[PDB]
C-alpha cells in the first residue's frame, strides 16, 4: 500500500477515528413561564412532540416536549383539556360554563357548546364515537355531537372517561360513587360505591380503570399505601402514578398494587403550594403540572 | 517488557459502581462471586482508607486507588 | 436468499421495551443472589411470552453471518433480540447449509451453542441429552395456549402444523386428542432445538380469533423433549432407520480402512 | 512493646496491593478521598448483603 | 439514618464548594519561611 | 492539583476563558455518561463504558491539539490543565511517539493485560487485518475492542 | 499437532478451582490377582475349656 492510498482509505471511515467505523423515576427538567397554576395537561397522540397545558390565568400554552404558541379565548380558569386522535381538533373546557372547540390547523375557535348549568370540569373525546362528553358541577353528563344527557348521582362530577365497548362512559363524583354508563339506554349499567370523593380516574392502555380516593386508590375491571391525602396516570408498562397534595409522588405497579417508590418534589424559589395538579405520560416520560406554576418532566 | 499501570479515568470506575447497584440480571452472576470473594480483602481496604484520612488542615484529598 | 439473504436482520424489541430482569412477585422479599422471591407460598410462575418470531419478517443478515458464526441467536427464536443486525449470532431458520457447518459441533451442544447434558431433565424440558439424537418435540399445554377455546380436535392440530412448519423441515406431526398433546418430528435435530425455544410459552390464538386481546392472560404451551414412541408400528420404523444408518456408515467406514490398509 | 520485639522476616516479598496490580483484573486511577470512602461503604454493604 | 442509603458523590458532594479547614493565620514577619507551604497536602512536593 | 476547586488549588491562567465552553461540553457529556442507565446486556453495558473512554480520549486530543499542534495555548496554561486533570499526562505522552500517533488509550498497549504478550488488536493496521482475512477467504472478524471499543488506533489509518 | 499448554491468569476474587467442592466419593476395589492366604496346615485338638 502507498501513502496516497492509505490517506484515501482512512477517509472511508464514517467517523474521524479511532472510533470511526470501517463498516425508579427521576426529574430530568423543569419548565417555567406560567403566570398562575396549571390545572390540566393534554398531549398530542400522533407524535408526542407538544403538550397543551391549561392554566389558572385562562391561557393555553403549547410546550414542545420551548413555548410554541399561546391560546387565549377563555374568560375563566381552564379546568380540563383534551386532544382528539382522528381529527386535528382540540376540545378545551373551563369554568366559564362553555366547551370550546379548537381547530389545530388555523388556531381559531370554531364551535361553542351550550346549555351547561354551571362550570365544566371535564372533557373526554372518543375518535370512534365522534362525540364529546362534558361533565361539570351540573352533575349530569352531557353527550355532545361534534344530544344525550345522563341523569346521574346528585353530586358534582370530578372525572369522566370514555371507552369503545359497553359501559362506555365512566363517571366519578364527590359523593364517592363511581358509575359505569350505558349511553344508548341512558341508564346506569353498574354502580361502584367502594370509594368512601373520587378525585381522579385513569383508563389502562387491560380494559380497566383506576379509581382514586383520598386515602385509598382502587382498580376496577385495591392499592396499598400509607395515607396520601388525594390525579392518576397509567403508563404502558403498567406502572401507575399517583399525585399527592402533600407533593409526594406515589408510583405503583398495577399488577401487584405494591408501591415501589415515593418521591417529593422541591417547591420553588410556600410549603402548601407544592402539590401535583395533573399528570400525563407520552405515547417513558412523565409530564406533571404543579399548582405553584411549574411543569416538571420525569424520566 | 514491563510497562506500568495505565491510569484509568475517574469516570470509568464511577460508571462501574453505579452499574452494580441493582445486580438483577443474569450477567452479574460472575460479578456477585467477585463481591463475595473480595470480603477477605476488605479489612485491608479499611486500613488503607483510614490511614489516608484527611488531616484537619485539608479541604479535600485526592488519593490514588486500585479497583477491581 | 430472497427471503433471508436479501435484507438485514431487524431489531425485534427495543432495549427499553425489553422485559424487566426481576420476575413477577411471588414472595415477600426479593433475593439478590438467586434473583427470585423468598418468603412466598407458591406460584405457577409460567406466563405467556409477550414476544413471538415472525420468521419471514425478522430474518436477515447479522454480524455473525460475516464473522462466520456457527450458532443461532437464542433471543431471535424467542422474538426478543434487541441487537438486531449488530448481533454476534445468526438470525435465520436452520438450513442444510447451516446444519452442515454444525455437523462436527452438534454432537455435544445445541444449535444455540448451549452445552447438552448426560441424561435428560426429569420433566423432559431444557436443552437436551447428547446420548440420544432426539428430533421429536412434545407439544403440550395446548389448553393454556388456546386460552381454553374448544377449537375442535382437528383444528388444534392444524394450528400446530401451521406454526411449526415455518421453523424448518418436518418429518411428521401427530396430534393426540385424548392426551391433548402433539408430537412434532423434524428432519434435523437443529430445527427441533430451534423450534423448542421458539414455541416455548407461546400461544396459538391466530389474531382473527376473539381472544387475541387476552393472549397474555393465559398459561402458555409447553414444548419439551419427547419420549420414545411406544407403538410397534413406529418401533419397527426405528430399527429400520437405524439399520439404514448403519449401512450408510459401514460404507463410509470400509473406505477409512481402504485408506489405512 | 520494648520488651518483646517481633522482628519482620525478609522473605515476605509478596505484598497484597503489588500482586493485585500485576493482574489484569485491577485498574488504577486517582479519585477523591471522600469519594473512595463512599464507594467502600457501598461496596462493603454489597458484600455483606 | 440507617434507612437512607449513602448518597452519591457526584449528585451531592462534588458540585459544592468545600469549606475552610483548620488553619492558624501564620503571622507574616515571624513565620515567613513556612507560611507558603505549611498546609499543603504534601508540603514542598514539587520543590526540587 | 485536585479536580475539585479547593483553596490550595491555583487559579487558571489567561487563555482558559476562551477554551472553557469547549471543555464544559466534554464535562457535561461525562456526567451524562455515568448516569447509571440500567441495561441488562453485557454487550450494552461495556458499550457504555466505551463511551467514557472515547470522551476521555477526545478531551485530551483537544488539549493536545491546542498546545502541540496549533500552539494556541501557553505552556503555563497547559501545565495547569495537566495538574487539574483536564488532560491525561501519560496518554498525551504517547501521542508524541512515532508509532503511537493516534493511540486508542493506555490500556490497549499493555503487554501484561493480554493472555499473550501482545497489544490490543485495534493497534494492528486495518490493511494488515484485511490481508490475513483475505488468505482465509473471510471478512475480518474484528469490529470493536473489548477495552474501550476502538476501531483501529494505528497511525497509518 | 504440537500444542502449547498455557495457564489462564486467574481473577484473585473469583474462586480458583471452580469444580472443587467438598463431596464424598466411594471407591471401587481393583482386584486383578487373588492374594493366596498362605497359612500352614492344622495341635488342633481342643476340649470345651474355651
Ligand atoms: Zn440476536
Ligand atoms: Zn484502539
Ligand atoms: Zn483502547
Ligand atoms: Zn483496543
mmCIF file of N, CA and C and ligand atoms in Angstrom, chain A residues 18, chain F residues 104-105 108 122-123 145 148 150-153, ligand 2:
data_model
loop_
_atom_site.group_PDB
_atom_site.id
_atom_site.type_symbol
_atom_site.label_atom_id
_atom_site.label_comp_id
_atom_site.label_asym_id
_atom_site.label_seq_id
_atom_site.Cartn_x
_atom_site.Cartn_y
_atom_site.Cartn_z
ATOM 1 N N UNK A 18 -10.320 7.380 16.424
ATOM 2 C CA UNK A 18 -10.162 5.920 16.378
ATOM 3 C C UNK A 18 -11.475 5.146 16.401
ATOM 4 N N UNK F 104 -5.155 4.666 20.857
ATOM 5 C CA UNK F 104 -6.549 4.472 21.315
ATOM 6 C C UNK F 104 -6.685 4.814 22.806
ATOM 7 N N UNK F 105 -5.779 4.301 23.643
ATOM 8 C CA UNK F 105 -5.723 4.611 25.099
ATOM 9 C C UNK F 105 -4.526 3.870 25.705
ATOM 10 N N UNK F 108 -4.772 -0.253 25.868
ATOM 11 C CA UNK F 108 -4.686 -1.085 24.674
ATOM 12 C C UNK F 108 -3.261 -1.324 24.184
ATOM 13 N N UNK F 122 -6.827 -3.536 18.068
ATOM 14 C CA UNK F 122 -7.042 -2.233 17.452
ATOM 15 C C UNK F 122 -5.744 -1.464 17.229
ATOM 16 N N UNK F 123 -4.622 -1.910 17.797
ATOM 17 C CA UNK F 123 -3.328 -1.359 17.415
ATOM 18 C C UNK F 123 -2.865 -1.835 16.046
ATOM 19 N N UNK F 145 -12.796 -3.260 19.997
ATOM 20 C CA UNK F 145 -12.030 -3.942 21.023
ATOM 21 C C UNK F 145 -12.780 -3.896 22.345
ATOM 22 N N UNK F 148 -12.053 -0.481 25.132
ATOM 23 C CA UNK F 148 -12.773 0.821 25.043
ATOM 24 C C UNK F 148 -13.503 0.988 23.707
ATOM 25 N N UNK F 150 -12.443 0.646 20.541
ATOM 26 C CA UNK F 150 -11.730 1.245 19.431
ATOM 27 C C UNK F 150 -11.907 0.432 18.158
ATOM 28 N N UNK F 151 -11.633 1.088 17.041
ATOM 29 C CA UNK F 151 -11.814 0.525 15.716
ATOM 30 C C UNK F 151 -10.544 0.676 14.891
ATOM 31 N N UNK F 152 -9.397 0.742 15.559
ATOM 32 C CA UNK F 152 -8.130 0.960 14.890
ATOM 33 C C UNK F 152 -7.391 2.204 15.341
ATOM 34 N N UNK F 153 -6.318 2.063 16.132
ATOM 35 C CA UNK F 153 -5.542 3.272 16.537
ATOM 36 C C UNK F 153 -4.264 3.417 15.702
HETATM 37 ZN ZN1 LIG H 2 -7.881 1.348 19.881
#
